[PDB]
Structure formats: C-alpha cells, structure tokens
Design a protein around this nucleic acid. Structure first.
Ligand SMILES: *C1O[C@@H]2[C@H](O)[C@@H](COP(=O)(O)OP(=O)(O)OC[C@H]3O[C@@H](n4cnc5c(N)ncnc54)[C@H](O)[C@@H]3O)O[C@@H]2S1
Ligand SMILES: [Zn+2]
Lengths: 112, 78, 100, 289, 93, 95, 83, 105, 93
DNA sequence: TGGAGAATCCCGGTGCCGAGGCCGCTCAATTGGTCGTAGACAGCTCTAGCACCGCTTAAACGCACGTACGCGCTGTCCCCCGCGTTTTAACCGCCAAGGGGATTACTCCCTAGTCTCCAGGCACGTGTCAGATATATACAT
DNA sequence: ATGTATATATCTGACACGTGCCTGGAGACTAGGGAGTAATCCCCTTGGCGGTTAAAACGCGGGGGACAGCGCGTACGTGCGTTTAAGCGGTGCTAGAGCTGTCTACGACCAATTGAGCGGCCTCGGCACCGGGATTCTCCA
C-alpha cells in the first residue's frame, strides 16, 4: 500500500474525520453514511471549538492568566449572544455567573 | 438533614444571583425548591443506575439525568 | 496598585454581591449537601453508593439552578417596585418558568 | 483641556495646594543640567517619565501647582483653561524625546499624562506606557484591541463610547463586536496589565531614569523611579515643586523642563523636530547613529 | 481500559489559535463534553432530516441543513462556510 | 349602560368558552406570506400550513398573555402594561 | 406581490380578544404594539425553520408537515396536522 | 391466534410497532418482546386519554369527541398535563379560568 | 400511495372504553399525532438507554426503563404494569 | 331592602355533510427453518467508596440596636372602557390556469463489507517549569 | 529598637513532553441497490370577481385606578462574641466495577403462505341552525 495520509490532512482539518465517520456509523443515525458527512461535521465541530477557545483565551488575557479555566469558558460563552443562545441550557461546571448588579440596587451618590 | 442548607448558604446563593435584600421567609421556600429539584434529578439518576444493574450512582448517570431534564452539565465527561 | 464605625445598611450587601459574583467556588458546604443527597436518594433505593464526582455534579447543578432562580426572583421583586425578594416573587418566577 | 479632577471622582485627597515654585539660579541650573548630560550621555538604559508638567507649556494646566486645577478647585472656584486636546500643540520636549528614541539613547518612556501628546508626536507606541491612559485611544473590551482616533472619544471611567470593534480574525472566526471602552483610570481602578509590566521591566533595567513634569505623588507612576535606583542606578528628578521623593533624589532641578531639556540637547549637540498633527506611529523606528 | 476523547485535537486547535496559552484539565473536560453534545445534536437533526425526506443516508447536505437549523446568527453562516470549504478541499483531493 | 369593567369579564368568559380562531384568517395569511418573503422568494403555502401557523401563534399569544396577566397581578395592578410582557418573556428565557 | 406592513392586519380588537381569552380584564394602550412585535418575532422563527425544512426537501411549497416539524424543533409540538 | 397482537391481550398493531422499531434506526437489533411492551403502553395511554375525553363529551351533552374535549381532558388531569405540557391541540381552546381578584366584589 | 394511521385501533379502544361515543376526523388526527409522538419518545429513550450501556438490542427492559423515565408517577406505574402483563401473556402463549 | 333588562339557559323542528358500515383485494403480517454472535453467566481482582478519629479553625449561630424599607391611606388626572354611527374589508361562493407534487422506469454511481498493513493515539513516567508560601533582610518610624 | 514590607529561595503540584505498545484507521477491492434523472399526470394553489355584511374604526363622555406622595411600624443588616461541626490528613476494610473466558439462546434473514386494513362504494343521523319561553347578575333606586 501507499503512504497512509489521513482524511483530516487531505481535508485540511484538525479534528479527526475517520473517528467522526466511525461515530456516525456506529451511532445508529442512518442505514448508511455519506463520504462527505464526516468531513462537514468535523469541520463544524472544529470551528465551534475554535470560536469557544479563542473567546476563552481573550477572557483569560483580560483576567491576567496564561491558562484557561472553566471560569474563562463561562465568561466567553455568556458574553457572546450567539453562543449563549446555543449554550442556553448548559451549566458549565465551576463557571460562576456574570457580574450583573441591577441599577435599582446600586446606591445613590452625589452626597456631601 | 435538610436544615444542613444553612441560612448563610442561601444568602450567599442570593448574593451570587444578585439579590440585595432577602425576606426572612425566603429560606424555607428555597429549601423546598432545592428539595424538589434534587428529588427529580436523583430519581432520574437512580432509575438510570438501576437499569444498568449497578449499586453505585456513577457521575455519568447524573449527567444523563440532567440532560434528560434539559439541564446538560459539562465538565464531568459524556 | 489602583489609582490613589458603622456602614450604612446596604453597602456590605453590595460588597458581598461583588465578591460572590466574581468567584467560582461552590457556595454550599459539601458534607451537609452530601448528607442531603444521600437522604433524598434513600427514599428510592437503599444501600445506594454515590461516586464523589456524582455528588459534585449534583451540587453544581443545584447551585446553578438556585442562582438562576434567585436572579429571576430578584428581577420579579424589582418589577413589583421592591428590593427585598419575598416568597411570592419565587412563586411567580417558577410559575412563569413553567415549573409551577 | 477638560480637567481630570471632577471627571475622576469627587473624592480627592490631594492635600497639596501650597507649592512654592522654587526656581534655580541660572548658573546652578546650568551646572546641574551639565552633570545630568554627562551622566546620561554614557548611561545606556535610559527611560523617561513625563508627567503633567510637560504639557503645561502646551497650554493645558497642571494639577498640583498654583495654577493646578485641583489647587483652584480647593481654594475657591476658578478653573482657567486656554487650549483643547484637539488643538493641543505638542511641546518641544515631546519631539525632543522622539529624537532621543530615534537615536536610540532613550531606551523607554513611561508617561502618566492624559492628552496623549507623546502618541500624537509620533512616539512608537510599543515604547510608551500610558499608565493612566489616553483620550485618543479606545480599547475593545472583548479582545483588548486598541484603536487610535484623531478625535477624543469623550468618556470617563472606563465606559462604553458607542462604537463597536471593527477588527476581524483568522480561520473564519467572526469579526469582533466589542464595546470599545475608553482609557482613563478613575480613582481605585486597575492599571493596564502589560503596559505596567513593560514599564516595570524598563525601569528595573534602567541604570539612569529621569522623571519630568510630575510630582510623583501618584500611585506606581511616581514609584517607578524608586525602583530605577534600587538594585543600582541613579535618579534625576527634574521638577519645580518639591517632589515626594526629593530625599531619595540623586539629582534635582528648579527650572522649566523646556529650558533644561533644550540645554541638555545643546550640550549633547542634539536637535529637535517640530511637531505635527496626529501623525501616529507604532512600530519602533530603527536606531540612528 | 481504553478511553476516547477529543483532548488532543482541542489542544491542537487551541495552540493554532492561541500560540501561548494553556488549558486546565477541567476546562479540557468541558470542551470535550461540548464537542460531544454538539456532535450528538447535529447528528440527530441530520438523522431526522434524512427520515423526513424518506432518504436512507446522511450527506453533507443533511449536515448543512442541521447546522442551519441548530446554530443561530452568524455562527451558522460561518459554520456552513467552513464545512463547505472543508468538503470541497477534501473532494478536490 | 354598564359600569366599566363588567363586560370585560363577559368577554373573558365568552372567548374562553369558545374555540374558534380569534385572529382574522386573511390578514394572518398576508402577514405569514410577508414574513416568508424575507427568507425565500415565491413560496406556496398550503392552507393547512397557514392554519397550523395561526393555531400555534394564537396558542403562544394566549399563553404569553396569561403569564403577563399573572405578572401584572403580582405587581398590584389590574391593567397589563408592556413591562409585564417583558418580564414574562425574560423569566421564560425568551429574548 | 411584495407585501408590506401587514403586521397592522393584527388589529386592536383581535389582540383584545386574545388577551380576554388569556384572562385579562384591562389592557393598556401600549400593549398592542408590543404584542404585534412579539407575534412577528415568533412567526419569523417558525417560518425560518419551516422554510429551511422546505428548501432542504427540494420543494417550493411549505407543507403543513414543515410547520409541524418547525414547531416540534422549538419545543412547541402541535397535534392535528400530522406527525 | 395467528397475529401477534391477538396472542397478547392488545388491540394495537404489534407487527406495525415491530416494523417501525426495526426501520426507525433505533438499534441494530430489536428484541422480540419490545413490540408487545410498546404497543401495550400506547394502548393504555390512548385508553386513558380517550376515557377522559369521552367523560368530558358526556358532561358536555355531546355524543362524539371533538378537539375541545381532548384539550379539556388533557389539561384537567395533572399527570397527562405534565406528560403533554409542551403540546398544543389545534381547535382545542383554553381551559376556562379567571383570576381570584378580577371577580366583582 | 396509501398512508398508515392508527385510526382503526384508536376506534377499537374508544368502542371498548366508550361503547356509545363517536369521534371527529380532527380528533382522530390529533390522537394519531399523539400516539406517534409518544411512540417516538419511548423508542428514542430506549435507544439512548441501550447506547449508554453499550448494548445493541432494544429489549423489553430498555422499553420499561424508558416508559419509567418519561411518564410521571401514576401514569408510569400503570403503563409499566400493563406492559409487563402484555409481555407475560405473549411469551406464555 | 326593592324593580326593570341585556344577555343567557333551555324546549321544539329539523336536514345536510360528515360519521359509519361493505367490500375486493394486495401488499404486509405470519409460520417454519438456518446461522452467526450478542449477550447471559461465572470468576478474579483491585479501584475506590465507605467508616472512623484528632486536630484546626472557618464558618454557623444567638443576640442587640437602628434605620431603611414595606405597607397602607389619600388625592389627582388621565387613560382606558362602553356605546353608537361609519366604513372598511373579511368571508363565501364559484370558476380557470397551470405550477408543482406524486408516481414510474433506467441506471449508475456510491457506500457497505473484507482484508491487509501500520502509524496515530493512548497509558504511563518523568522531569521541568511555574506559582505560592515562608523566611530573611533592610528600611522607616 | 521593633515592626512591616519586599525580595528571593525552595518546595510542591500540575502539565507538557517523551517513550513504547497496539488496534483502529487507510488503501485497494468488489457487489448491488438508493437515489439521480427524465417523463407523465392531475391536485391543489393562486388568482380573480361580486355581493352581503360582520367586524374594525372613529369619536365621546365618564369613572376607575395608576401613580405619586406622606407617614408609621418593624424586619432585616450589620456587628460582636460564643459554638460547632466542616475540612484535612491519616489508616483500615471490603462491595462491587471492570475486565476476561466460555457458551447458547436469540435476533437477522430467507422462502413460502394468506388475511386484514385501505380505497372507493353508499346510507343514515348529530347537531348547527332556526323560532320562542323562562332565567341570572347589572344597574339603578
Ligand atoms: C490621574 O491622572 C493624573 C496624571 O496621570 C498625573 C498628573 O500629575 P503628575 O504628572 O504626576 O504631577 P504634576 O501635578 O504634573 O507635578 C508636576 C509639577 O510640575 C509643575 N510644572 C508645571 N510646568 C512645569 C515645567 N515646564 N517644568 C517643571 N515643572 C513644571 C507643576 O506645577 C506641578 O507642580 O497624576 C494624576 S492622577
Ligand atoms: Zn474587539
């Protein structure tokens, strides 16, 4: 046989295409699975992961760290409307909540 | 055993939520709501565990229970 | 560095809000909550063993649920021209959510 | 020339309004600038510190002096102004420092002023540390992307200005929509992360740092030249008013910063460019012989 | 025991987008669970789409339609763009 | 003449007893076609499709109004205002 | 052919009837515009999903089953039209 | 008898349930006892909902069943209501009720 | 082509429980949709249960667990009792 | 307390479109038999849940005091609601065109299934790096 | 002379990197059936017109409550000191989670058979609709 160049390398991805193909086949989603379905699904998953990770890295920069923690993922998700809608029902563990304080609860200044 | 959720714990949860003042009668209602939520989640998880013929409630059983109730929980695998 | 008696009732509460909304640690004592989980699961199946990760997952879920419920309760109380959340606020929030 | 006195916060514990404008004799001033020039000409790592005394020559008043805004706001009520940041004419010292960086003698610069005249003077932004901030700079809250504007953003207290981030990223990751907040620190607010880090690194590496036009009363900004002399190094404090660390000062001047800098350049044989508009430049210009 | 996870690929993507930034084990677990959840959702929607049209296969068209249905806003548009580019590059090879 | 408020309850009872479609069918169909014009051009809605859309919309609006009325009554009022609708939609995760 | 501002077709008496069915005794004047906007948003979501289903199926007509599937996706399953 | 539905005490089609399970892409294999169970559950649930709807029809002086009767039956029973919380019955209407304060005093 | 519906069996059950009552076409369609939806729910939950435990067959146990997880208390108990009765009467003869 | 009414519950007659039954049959459900394997059952082990104790000590609990808030009462005014007349367009009944959904052949390209080969991916080890804490020294009061 | 702050050093933990081991993935192959693709048919959607007419629109008056303000009681916030049980780090034990090994009961599949549920057929009635007679909160008095 010739050199075994993985499907991901040909596609240009970073996520596995063979693994996602096997998950689709063994996942019992259809009697047969197309040859382009794993590539498309892997590309979509990689894009979503890259988006979350980029926003989490920005959050970690803002929080003055060099290592992503769950709090950074929660901040990256809840601060982006699209991801918040997509991840509305998730509860990221050890993520806390956004710093929201209602205006009415704030005190009234201009004293003295 | 329910009283293990002390008033300072509920006050801290409210402060995390954003509450500024808490009526004295909130605490019992919060305990009841917690009890109902835990009852539902534990019932689903224990049903999952019993199905798999296990005497131990694995974490993945709790994750699946939460997913069933539309409360997917990340960070525990699955 | 930054750029540089009795407190009025209401400022220490704001300090607590600022403190607890910037942290991530669970806000319930682990041992009493674990005992509560065991007691609740007792009514379903006896001699039921819990993984530590299972109890932690339950605690995280319950903490998130209660924080969200309290956020909605505070919004409801503010809607009623008030600052102190009352049980009726919690009941209204749950009723609108569909859980009641 | 809007004042950062009421804009920052009502709380203002300056406690400094009696400031005798001591002036040095011309001969003693000449000798002191001479010894400063002799030291600086051979010192390699030289980092400067420009405060709100440089831009007084431009026209925007200082803060602590007799004509300082806080001084007038404390003793009665009479804030006088003449110019505006948009019309702010750069002082000769700004272009002098630009030339110093051009020839490479000026290792770094850590300013604390707010008009951003150094940025408008063409000083490489990678060499400056606007600790307190700059009106002509608005940074994106989300991705910490910084935009240089030719018009003042017009906001105080690190607040949203009304414009959304307009930069994009690789891989098809969506273009950002950050709030584009302003850069001026209110009392009890954090400093800008790695700008402060770079300032600390430069001052520690500085075997000779001279601090100009600042009273050094303020947080860190006045403490960097303390660290410039710890672990070795000499400190030259060129300021009219008695600074908070004159006891620790290894040198002192009582004269106009413009005059002393001009004498320093004349002794060094150095010339000065002649201002510009908002001719902003970021990348460090190559060193000159 | 042989456990399966997306950890290596997530780390590779992170190092591709953030050259100097680590990721905690807990954060990695959250990301792996997120990938699993999104995969399950998209695959299930694709399966239902195939069953509605009486088709017995899943194709890039079904995945694209599922992505359109699930992801909101510009997220879906860019996800479809990336998937189309990936599929066309793969087919070209 | 009737003192104000008494016939509001009569209308409540009448429209809760009945089960017809409150919104007029033709304006709703025109609204649906206008909405669909945004996404894809020159569609052809089956009559059953627009009937399903109308049933779904009416059920959604009735439920939203019930929640809004609950919110208003909680606020010590009898009249529903936009803020009650905003509260009801926010507590339900919408918007 | 290009329909315009048909949202006004939802008249004040229609929204009043909907409110009365919902148990409302008194309705503010500002309620009507808000209700129209909410209805428009809901319809946009449902129609977007239905049109996506239709376009995937290679058809040019929005079958009732498309609307049923769209409602099912958004957690508002409808009975009485198939599926 | 011959038909599986006949051997069990059911009225629902066991064969159709088995065919749907096999063709539905649920699992590679389908146990021979699963269709009986699923058909039994479906038959019981249909019996319950139809019984409640028929009771509503009888209380409504109607000899038949219309969507309104089904809606009333579903909403007036707590267990089914929780089961069918996210469903809307076309032409079913809304359960009649008024608030406790809007009534005349 | 001819379509498939549960109309006949819903009719039989209605006659068994209400021997003197009819049903409208709309009500029959609603009942058909309800039966389809409940069947889909139970079957999908059974499939997930089988997939979680690495099983490959949807046996009666998977269906029992699914119906216990979906229906509320009394409904689930009665449904599981009737299912067990049906399976017992089927396998016995 | 009482008295007139708009709207509502209810009795009698009844005929049409929808519910209900008939029936031929044709594809789907049923019976019997073959074969491979997915799972039933039994064993082994050793991972981790569980139980208990002593010391630290962070947090929980009880009380005291005061003020900030909730709650209630009262008084505009203004903003809905109810009713009556105009009018605006839905609703229905019918008819025509034709697009597009639904079914049917031909077929041909794509994917399931196999087999062989082997690098990518995981378990484990490790060492290296980073962060936090403690101690010591220097400076200031 | 003492206290506090800062700096440096060391220790611990976590993780990125390195390594061997193996099994799941890639290349080459064949067979057959799922679904493209074209043709044809006709069901249903769009579109129009016209008449009656049900409901929307507009105006007008009044009266109900939304909302603001003011005053009183007290419930919660904040602080302090005393309690107590959570937290952590030890051991010590063992239930059972996970893996392996073996074998058989069972689901897939196939051939052949037949019967029952569906499309189209007709017949009969439930209640929407109409007429009037008696009844219940509203409003007024
Ligand atoms: C937040 O932002 C503000 C900003 O960052 C600085 C401003 O104050 P400093 O620059 O720290 O000190 P400053 O008040 O400027 O002290 C300098 C003194 O110098 C006198 N002065 C005026 N003109 C001068 C020339 N040409 N040469 C020498 N000295 C000169 C001023 O009168 C002043 O006393 O911190 C705040 S807080
Ligand atoms: Zn940005």
């Amino acid at each position: 046989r010739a050199k075994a160049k993985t499907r991901s390398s040909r596609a240009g991805l970073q996520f596995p295409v063979g693994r996602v193909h096997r998950l689709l086949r063994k996942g019992n989603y259809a009697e047969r699975v197309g040859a382009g379905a794993p590539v498309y699904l892997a590309a979509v998953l990689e894009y979503l992961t890259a988006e979350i990770l980029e926003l989490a890295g920005n959050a970690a920069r803002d929080n003055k760290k060099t290592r992503i923690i769950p709090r950074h993922l929660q901040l990256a998700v809840r601060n982006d409307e699209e991801l918040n809608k997509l991840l509305g029902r998730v509860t990221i563990a050890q993520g806390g909540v956004l710093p929201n304080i209602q205006s009415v609860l704030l005190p009234k200044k201009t004293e003295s | 055993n329910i009283q293990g959720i002390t008033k300072p714990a509920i006050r801290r949860l409210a402060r995390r939520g954003g509450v500024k003042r808490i009526s004295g009668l909130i605490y019992e209602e919060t305990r009841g709501v917690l009890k109902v939520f835990l009852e539902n989640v534990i019932r689903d998880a224990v049903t999952y565990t019993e199905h798999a013929k296990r005497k131990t409630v694995t974490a993945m059983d709790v994750v699946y229970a939460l997913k069933r109730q539309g409360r997917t929980l990340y960070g525990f695998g699955g | 560095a930054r750029k540089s008696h009795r407190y009025r009732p209401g400022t220490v509460a704001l300090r607590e809000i600022r403190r607890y909304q910037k942290s991530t640690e669970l806000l319930i004592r682990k041992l009493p909550f674990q005992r509560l989980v065991r007691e609740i699961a007792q009514d379903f199946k006896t001699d039921l063993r819990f993984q530590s990760s299972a109890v932690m997952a339950l605690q995280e879920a319950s903490e998130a649920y209660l924080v969200a419920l309290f956020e909605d309760t505070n919004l409801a109380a503010i809607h009623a021209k008030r600052v102190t959340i009352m049980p009726k606020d919690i009941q209204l929030a749950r009723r609108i959510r569909g859980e009641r | 020339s809007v004042n950062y006195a009421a804009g920052l916060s009502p709380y203002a514990d300056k406690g400094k309004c009696g400031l005798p404008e001591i002036f040095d004799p011309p001969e003693e001033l000449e000798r002191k600038v001479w010894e400063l020039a002799r030291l600086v000409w051979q010192s390699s790592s030289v980092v400067f510190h420009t405060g709100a005394g440089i831009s007084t020559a431009s026209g925007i008043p200082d803060f602590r002096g007799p004509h300082g805004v806080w001084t007038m706001e404390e003793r009665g009520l009479a804030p006088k102004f003449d110019t505006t940041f948009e019309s702010a004419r750069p002082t000769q010292t700004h272009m002098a420092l630009v030339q110093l960086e051009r020839v490479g003698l000026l290792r770094f610069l850590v300013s604390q002023n707010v008009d951003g005249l150094h940025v408008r003077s063409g000083f490489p932004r990678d060499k400056l540390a606007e600790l307190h901030g700059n009106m002509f700079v608005e940074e994106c809250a989300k991705c910490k992307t910084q935009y240089v504007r030719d018009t003042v953003v017009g906001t105080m207290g690190l607040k949203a200005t009304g414009r959304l981030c307009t930069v994009a990223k690789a891989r098809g990751l969506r273009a950002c929509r950050g709030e584009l907040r302003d850069t001026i620190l209110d009392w009890e607010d954090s400093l800008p992360d790695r700008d402060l880090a770079l300032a600390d690194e430069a001052s520690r590496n500085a075997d000779l740092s001279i601090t100009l036009g600042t009273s050094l009363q303020i947080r860190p900004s006045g403490n960097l030249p303390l660290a410039t002399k710890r672990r070795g190094g000499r400190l030259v404090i060129v300021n009219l008013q008695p600074t908070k660390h004159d006891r620790h000062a290894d040198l002192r001047i009582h004269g106009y910063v413009d005059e002393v800098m001009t004498r320093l350049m004349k002794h060094l044989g150095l010339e000065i460019p002649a201002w510009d508009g908002p001719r902003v430049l970021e990348r460090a210009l190559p060193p000159l012989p | 025991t042989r456990k399966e996870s997306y950890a290596i690929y997530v780390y590779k993507v992170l190092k591709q987008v953030h050259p100097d930034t680590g990721i905690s084990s807990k954060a990695m677990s959250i990301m792996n669970s997120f990938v699993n959840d999104v995969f399950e959702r998209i695959a299930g929607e694709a399966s239902r789409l195939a069953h509605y049209n009486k088709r017995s296969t899943i194709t890039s068209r079904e995945i694209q339609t599922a992505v359109r249905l699930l992801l909101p806003g510009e997220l879906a548009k860019h996800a479809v763009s990336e998937g189309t580019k990936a599929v066309t590059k793969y087919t070209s090879a």
